[PDB]
Symmetry: none
Subunit: 44 residues, 35 copies
Amino acid sequence: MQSVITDVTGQLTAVQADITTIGGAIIVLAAVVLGIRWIKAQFF
Amino acid sequence: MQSVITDVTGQLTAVQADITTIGGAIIVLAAVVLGIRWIKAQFF
Amino acid sequence: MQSVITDVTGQLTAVQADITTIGGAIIVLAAVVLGIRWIKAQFF
Amino acid sequence: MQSVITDVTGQLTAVQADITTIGGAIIVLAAVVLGIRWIKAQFF
Amino acid sequence: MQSVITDVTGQLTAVQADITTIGGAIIVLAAVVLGIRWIKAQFF
Amino acid sequence: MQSVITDVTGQLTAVQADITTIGGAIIVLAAVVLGIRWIKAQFF
Amino acid sequence: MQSVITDVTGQLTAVQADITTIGGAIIVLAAVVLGIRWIKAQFF
Amino acid sequence: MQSVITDVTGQLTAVQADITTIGGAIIVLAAVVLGIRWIKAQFF
Amino acid sequence: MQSVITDVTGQLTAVQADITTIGGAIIVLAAVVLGIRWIKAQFF
Amino acid sequence: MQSVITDVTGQLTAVQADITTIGGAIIVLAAVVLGIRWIKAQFF
Amino acid sequence: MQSVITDVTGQLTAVQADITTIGGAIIVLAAVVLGIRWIKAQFF
Amino acid sequence: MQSVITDVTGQLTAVQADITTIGGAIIVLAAVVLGIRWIKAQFF
Amino acid sequence: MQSVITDVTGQLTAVQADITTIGGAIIVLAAVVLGIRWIKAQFF
Amino acid sequence: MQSVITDVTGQLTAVQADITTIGGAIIVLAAVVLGIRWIKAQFF
Amino acid sequence: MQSVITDVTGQLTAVQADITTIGGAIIVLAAVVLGIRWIKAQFF
Amino acid sequence: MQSVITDVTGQLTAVQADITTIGGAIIVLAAVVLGIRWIKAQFF
Amino acid sequence: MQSVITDVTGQLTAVQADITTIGGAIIVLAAVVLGIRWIKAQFF
Amino acid sequence: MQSVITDVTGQLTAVQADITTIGGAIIVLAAVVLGIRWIKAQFF
Amino acid sequence: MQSVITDVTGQLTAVQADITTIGGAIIVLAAVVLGIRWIKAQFF
Amino acid sequence: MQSVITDVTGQLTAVQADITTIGGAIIVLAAVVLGIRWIKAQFF
Amino acid sequence: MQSVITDVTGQLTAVQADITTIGGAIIVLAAVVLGIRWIKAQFF
Amino acid sequence: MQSVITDVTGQLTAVQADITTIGGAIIVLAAVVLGIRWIKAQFF
Amino acid sequence: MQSVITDVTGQLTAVQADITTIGGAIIVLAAVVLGIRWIKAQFF
Amino acid sequence: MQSVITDVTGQLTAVQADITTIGGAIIVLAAVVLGIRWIKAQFF
Amino acid sequence: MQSVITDVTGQLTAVQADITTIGGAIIVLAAVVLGIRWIKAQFF
Amino acid sequence: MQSVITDVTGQLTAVQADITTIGGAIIVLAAVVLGIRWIKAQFF
Amino acid sequence: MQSVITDVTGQLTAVQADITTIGGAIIVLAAVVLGIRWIKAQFF
Amino acid sequence: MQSVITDVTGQLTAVQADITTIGGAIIVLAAVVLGIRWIKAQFF
Amino acid sequence: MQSVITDVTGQLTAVQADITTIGGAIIVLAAVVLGIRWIKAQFF
Amino acid sequence: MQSVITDVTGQLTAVQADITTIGGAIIVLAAVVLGIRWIKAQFF
Amino acid sequence: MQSVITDVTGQLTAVQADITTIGGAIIVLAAVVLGIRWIKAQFF
Amino acid sequence: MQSVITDVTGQLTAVQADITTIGGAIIVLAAVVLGIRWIKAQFF
Amino acid sequence: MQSVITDVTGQLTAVQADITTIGGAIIVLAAVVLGIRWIKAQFF
Amino acid sequence: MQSVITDVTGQLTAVQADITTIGGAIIVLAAVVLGIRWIKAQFF
Amino acid sequence: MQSVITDVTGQLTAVQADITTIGGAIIVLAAVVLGIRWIKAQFF
């Protein structure tokens, strides 16, 4: 029934935010991996 | 009888929408898994 | 008698249409299960 | 659920500091590789 | 965790001293390359 | 006599409706067994 | 008689709700199996 | 009866918590697999 | 039951320590790969 | 279990010594590459 | 194992001699480049 | 007589409770078969 | 009679414990299949 | 009966040791795959 | 049974030697790749 | 089995000779690059 | 196989001649750069 | 008479032991089917 | 009678050995599937 | 009977040789994939 | 049967030649990449 | 089959000519870089 | 294909003219650096 | 009479051999289904 | 009777050949799937 | 019967050609991926 | 059938042209990267 | 399809202009590096 | 896109002015090095 | 009588052909299910 | 009767075409999955 | 019936366009990943 | 359906802008890496 | 989403300032390398 | 972050003083080279 659909959706969206919130958090690390590494280069 | 057929159909279609509505919801997550991950790459 | 045969047939065919009409309806769901799922893949 | 997201975040940030703290430490070496090497040049 | 960071640091600093200690040692050679060479000049 | 026949019929038909009315009711359960189960799959 | 039919129905519907109510409950587990598992992936 | 439904539910929810509680526990390992591995990279 | 959850957890945490203890051990090698290699550079 | 951890460690350390012992050996070559090359310079 | 280390060493040293033996050979050329060139100067 | 009917009923109902009481008891096993088995999966 | 019910129950519960006790025992194997396998990965 | 449970357990544990004993044995290979491979790298 | 374990082990160890014996053989090539290549450098 | 090991070795050694035989051949070119180039210098 | 070695050699030598043949050709230019330049000097 | 009952019982119990004794015997095979099969998996 | 039980057992055990003897035989193949396959990897 | 076991074995071993004989054959290809590829590298 | 083995071999060898024949062909390109590139160098 | 080999070769050679034809073309530029640059020198 | 070669050539030549046209232009400057400088000399 | 028993037995055994003789014959097919299928795997 | 057995066998063997003859045919495809695919790799 | 075998074969071979014909077609793309890519390199 | 093969081919070729047409387009960029860069050099 | 090719081209060309437009811009700097530097020389 | 080009240019020009502005500044020093030095000459 | 036997046979054989004729027809579908599916794989 | 056979066939073939017609349609998607994906690669 | 085939096709084609339309969209990102990255290079 | 396509596109484009917006931001750093570095050169 | 873009930018700019601030700092050293060195010249 | 910049600066300045302090020290030597040399002149 519709029950299944609108309700499988209510979650499918709700979980997105979770996924994306976790991705951002990880990226700040990439951003910092380039912090620690652009610097080494500058010397050599 | 026809009773069985047209009526087994009335549902078979009605349930599709449910299935598909749930699929879309999940895909937005895939779309976001590529949000969190294309970004990491950019650093390295 | 023939009564039995031609008349058991009149139904055997009439019920087919019902069976098949119900099968089509279900397949549109399979078709949609591949809608929701080919998409996830594309990300990863 | 949100459980997943805010909690995957609580770590994603917490780990950044670790990454960056390790990068700084390494850079002080680059800074010193230029200590030992600018000096050789001065002679020749 | 912090475990990673403060501990990746404990080394990053500890290794600096090594790098720099090795650089000084090499420079004393540059200093001596200018010993052997300023002298030749003086003749000509 | 005919008494027996037309009258055994008056029931044979009358009872059909009962049988079929009970079958439909049960099928809505099958329809729901596929509600609860197509969903689990989607996760894994 | 009709007795049989309308009354076999009164149950056939009443039991549906039970079946479906049990299915939903189980699905929330699938939904959580994808909670615990999408997360592992993110690391590797 | 309703007996079946509300009672199949009382469990379906109760078991979720179990599933999810087990998932979290496992993820902390993923989180640590990225502890042990981001570090190796930093050297090379 | 809860039995499953709190008990699947008692392990999920207990195994983390194992994973992480093994990661640290490996990293000390990375740390040493940079020992053997920063040195070669210094010559050339 | 702990079995995994303390025992994955017993090796992680044991292998370090191997790695480092091999690095030293190679460096003595760098040290000699600067033997053969500082000399050529002196002429020109 | 130790196997790796003491054995990676047995070579690291053995190859040094090769490197250095080749360097000496080349230097005798530098020594001779200064043979052919100090002489030209003397005229002018 | 009515004797037969109301009295065949007094039992037909009384025995239901027995049947159903036995069914519940068995289901708690199914519920536990999913306890022991969802867990294995989680590893692999 | 009730005899049947309360007594079919006395077993239905008694057997649960058996089922579940056997499930736990098996899971400790899954837990160990992940012991032997997370380790291989770490190398490659 | 309990017979089933305590006795299905007596094995479930007894077999664990077997599984784990086999896992350790395999891991020593992973440990050696990293023996043969870290070495190649060192050259290039 | 123990049969499985001690016997899965008898092989797990026996195969290690094979793996490692093959790794050594390959490394002698790395060792030689550095033979052919350190030499080219010396010219330029 | 041993089959794997002694036989993976029979090749690992056999291929070395090939690698090294190819390296020597290339080096004679380096040796000649210094033939063509030390000469130009002599003029200027 | 030997195939690789003796055949990588057949080229390594064949290409030498090419390299050296090209070097000689260039040197005749150095020889001429000293033709055009020793002459200017003679005037001043 | 009671003759029938207590005596039909004296057997009903006596035969149980037989049934159960035969079941255990068979299960040891299941236990061994998992011996021969968990092992194959480990390879692949 | 007991006849049934002790005698259904005499076989249930006797057949185990057969099952297990066949499992071992098959596993030696798994063991060899990992012979032929770990090797390919080593190249690439 | 034993018939089953010793005879399921007579094959389980006989088939091993087949499996392994096929694996060796394939590996000689890996060995050659490293023939064609180590060579390209040498140029660049 | 042996059928499988000797016949899986008849191919495993037959395909080697193909692989290797293709590798040689590619290498002649590497050999030529060093033709076009050693030359540029000579100018600068 | 041979199909693969002789045919992978038919290309491997055919592509060489392309590679080499492109290299020559580029070298004429090196040859000209030494045209434009030997000249500047002559002045100073 | 030939496509690659004759077409990589069509450019390799076309670009030469560019390189050489730029070299000539620069040389006229060298020619003029000797204009401005031979003159100063004449005084002193 | 005994007539019935010993004579119903004379057959019960005589027919076993038939059953078992037919089972063996079929199994050789299973054995061959694993012939045709282990092979496909090896490719992929 | 024996009739059943020796005659159920006459087929059980006769059908094997069919099964196996069909398996070989399919494998030649696997063998070719590795024809078309090892080749792609070689490029990249 | 033989019917099954020789006829399952008539196809197993017939389909090979199809598989292989499709593989060749794809490889010409790999061959071209190396067309477009070896070229970029040449510049840098 | 042949259907599969000749038709999988009709595409395999048709797609090549696409791949190659895209490669050429990209190379013109490499060709231009050497436009912008050979020029900088000329100054210094 | 062609779709891919002509359209991957429409960009490959369009991006060239971008690359080249950026190169010119940079070269004007080289041209100016020779502005600031030819001048210093003139003094000394 | 054009975006890249016109915008990489907007900078390439903007940076020129910087380069040249810095060159002029330095030259005034050359101009002054000839101030301090033409004067010494005049005495001697 | 024999009447029964030879005549029950005349059919038992006659019907076989029917069964088998229907089986072949179905298999051509399996053969085609592998047509449509081996193809998808080739892409991914 | 034959009725069954030739008529079960008339369908078995008729349905093939359907199966295969559906397979082709799906494959064009695989063909396009490789359209969208070979392209991404080209960039990176 | 044909019903199945022509109708499974009507979709198989209709879905292609969807797949391909999604692929193009993604590629424009690859095209832009090379926008952001060719640029960084130009500096260094 | 079209649903999938036009909607997978609506994102594929929307995400481009994101990718490109992030690339520009990074390039301004390259542009600045050449700020800090062209300057050092000017001294030496 | 835009989320990704404007936010990847907010950093890309923020990090520039860091890069450039570090470059200036280094240049003041170049400026001083010309302090210590123009002076030596003045003597000789 | 700013962290990087202000902190890369804190050093860039701190190191200047070092560079300059070393330059002064060297210049006092130039100053003395003119001490020892103006004197010789005075005689001749």
